[PDB]
């Protein structure tokens, strides 16, 4: 999908954040640069002179991950339509900065001051951008204490709710699902003396493949249910596991037939 050209107005103070790594890479090695907010989008300029443009109206989610409990601080953009750079197609682009009783007290103080400085710099950039777009671009911060551990791809990571998404932006590839795009959640392997369970995210659009989050500790089941309840996202649980690849194909081929024969009540 062709993007609007970036409009730059130099008779204006354009908000700028420096010392940012872009992920995914533009070059063969990772590279730092500056992120500048312009009239209708962002431009990232690498130290090598590479330019990456992100138009505001191509941003589905703008995420702010503070360094609290992490070793990086991140601006993450989940895009409506994939863009090309580094000779590849990308639906996500982010920008981050890395972060004896006495020597420990020394360390604590430096850490707290460093983290405060970075967080303030990022927040100030965000507030400028939100004003410049007249609140039409709004950054979401995750709610860490609503988070839970699970493995969407290979290894376990922290998944955190924002107001409008379920996210992980510290590991790559990232994880972003839009809550209002979700049809239902189905928990699997909820049985017995459960140590962990799986969480299936089914989308309202049945042509989208389901999202599996594997191996979530059982202690997180009730907190997740309460969170889902707050979002008005319906959940069910089963003891065994369903073939979602086959099920979604069957539904996609004929959703009217699916609903005539009971729809999602088979989970109930």
UniProtKB/Swiss-Prot annotation:
For the cross-link Glycyl lysine isopeptide (Lys-Gly) (interchain with G-Cter in SUMO2), what are the residue positions?
A: 2
Which tissues does it occur in? Ubiquitous.
| Modification type Phosphothreonine: residues | 245
Q: Which cysteines are joined by disulfide bonds?
A: none
Q: Kindly provide the PTM information from the record.
A: ADP-ribosylated. ADP-ribosylation by PARP1 is induced by genotoxic stress and correlates with dissociation of FACT from chromatin.
In the record, Phosphoserine modifications are located at 5, 13
Q: Where in the cell is it found?
A: Nucleus; Chromosome
Q: Which residues carry this modification: N6-acetyllysine?
A: 87, 128, 246
Sequence similarity:
Belongs to the peptidase M24 family. SPT16 subfamily.
Q: What does this protein do?
A: Component of the FACT complex, a general chromatin factor that acts to reorganize nucleosomes. The FACT complex is involved in multiple processes that require DNA as a template such as mRNA elongation, DNA replication and DNA repair. During transcription elongation the FACT complex acts as a histone chaperone that both destabilizes and restores nucleosomal structure.
Q: What disease is linked with this protein in Swiss-Prot or TrEMBL?
A: Neurodevelopmental disorder with dysmorphic facies and thin corpus callosum: An autosomal dominant disorder characterized by global developmental delay, impaired intellectual development with poor or absent speech and language, and autistic-like behaviors. Corpus callosum anomalies are visible on brain imaging. Most patients have dysmorphic features including tall forehead, down-slanting palpebral fissures, ear anomalies and broad nasal bridge. Other variably present clinical features include seizures, sleeping difficulties and precocious puberty.
> Domain annotation text?
The C-terminal Glu-rich acidic region is essential for FACT activity.
Q: How does it assemble?
A: Interacts with MYOG (via C-terminal region). Component of the FACT complex, a stable heterodimer of SSRP1 and SUPT16H. Also a component of a CK2-SPT16-SSRP1 complex which forms following UV irradiation, composed of SSRP1, SUPT16H, CSNK2A1, CSNK2A2 and CSNK2B. Interacts with NEK9. Binds to histone H2A-H2B. Identified in a centromere complex containing histones H2A, H2B and H4, and at least CENPA, CENPB, CENPC, CENPT, CENPN, HJURP, SUPT16H, SSRP1 and RSF1. Interacts with GTF2E2. (Microbial infection) Interacts with Herpes simplex virus 1 (HHV-1) protein ICP22; this interaction relocalizes the FACT complex to viral genomes in infected cells.
Annotated protein name in UniProt: FACT complex subunit SPT16
| Gene name of the record | SUPT16H
Measured against the full-length protein, the chain present covers 646 to 926 of 1047
């Amino acid at each position: 999908v062709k993007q609007d050209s970036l409009v730059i107005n130099l008779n204006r103070s354009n908000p700028k954040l420096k010392d940012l790594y872009i992920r995914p890479n533009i070059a063969q090695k990772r590279m730092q640069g500056s992120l500048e907010a312009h009239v209708n989008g962002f431009r990232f300029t690498s130290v090598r002179g590479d330019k990456v443009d992100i138009l505001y109206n191509n941003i589905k989610h703008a995420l702010f991950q503070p360094c609290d409990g992490e070793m990086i601080i991140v601006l993450h953009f989940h895009l409506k339509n994939a863009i090309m750079f580094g000779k590849k197609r990308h639906t996500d682009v982010q920008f981050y900065t890395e972060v004896h009783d006495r020597d420990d007290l020394y360390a604590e103080q430096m850490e707290r001051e460093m983290r405060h400085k970075l967080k303030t710099a990022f927040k100030n950039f965000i507030e400028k951008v939100e004003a410049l777009t007249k609140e039409e671009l709004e950054f979401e911060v995750p709610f860490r204490d609503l988070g839970f551990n699970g493995a969407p791809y290979r290894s376990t990571c922290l998944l955190q709710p924002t107001s409008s998404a379920l996210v992980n932006a510290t590991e790559w590839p990232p994880f972003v699902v839009t809550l209002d795009e979700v049809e239902l959640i189905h928990f699997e392997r909820v049985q017995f003396h459960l140590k962990n369970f799986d969480m299936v995210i089914v989308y309202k659009d049945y042509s989208k493949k389901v999202t599996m989050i594997n191996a979530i500790p059982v202690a997180s089941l009730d907190p997740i249910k309460e969170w889902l309840n707050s979002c008005d996202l319906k959940y069910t649980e089963g003891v065994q596991s369903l073939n979602w690849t086959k099920i979604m194909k069957t539904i996609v081929d004929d959703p009217e037939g699916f609903f005539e024969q009971g729809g999602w009540s088979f989970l109930e």
